[PDB]
Coordinates of C-alpha atoms and ligand atoms in Angstrom, one line a residue:
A1 CA -25.6 18.5 -1.3
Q2 CA -23.8 21.7 -1.8
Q3 CA -25.7 24.4 0.2
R4 CA -29.5 24.2 0.2
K5 CA -30.1 26.3 -2.9
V6 CA -27.5 27.7 -5.6
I7 CA -24.8 29.9 -4.1
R8 CA -26.6 33.1 -4.4
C9 CA -23.4 35.2 -3.5
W10 CA -24.2 35.5 0.1
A11 CA -22.2 38.6 -0.1
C12 CA -24.9 40.1 -2.4
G13 CA -27.9 37.8 -2.6
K14 CA -28.3 36.8 -6.2
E15 CA -28.2 33.3 -7.6
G16 CA -25.5 32.9 -10.4
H17 CA -22.1 33.5 -8.6
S18 CA -20.3 33.1 -5.5
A19 CA -19.3 35.9 -2.8
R20 CA -15.7 35.2 -4.0
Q21 CA -16.7 37.1 -7.2
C22 CA -19.3 39.3 -5.6
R23 CA -19.0 42.2 -8.0
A24 CA -21.8 43.9 -6.1
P25 CA -20.6 46.1 -3.2
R26 CA -23.8 45.5 -1.0
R27 CA -26.7 47.4 -2.6
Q28 CA -25.1 49.0 -5.9
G29 CA -25.3 46.8 -9.0
Ligands
ZN1 ZN1 -22.4 38.8 -5.8

C-alpha cells in the first residue's frame, strides 16, 4: 500500500496534496 489513507499533507492535514507542496503554513489557508 502507500500510507493508510491518502497523503493528507501531514504538514497541514488535508487530503489532496503532500507536505512537499503544503501551501498551508499550519493554520492559515
Ligand atoms: Zn498542505
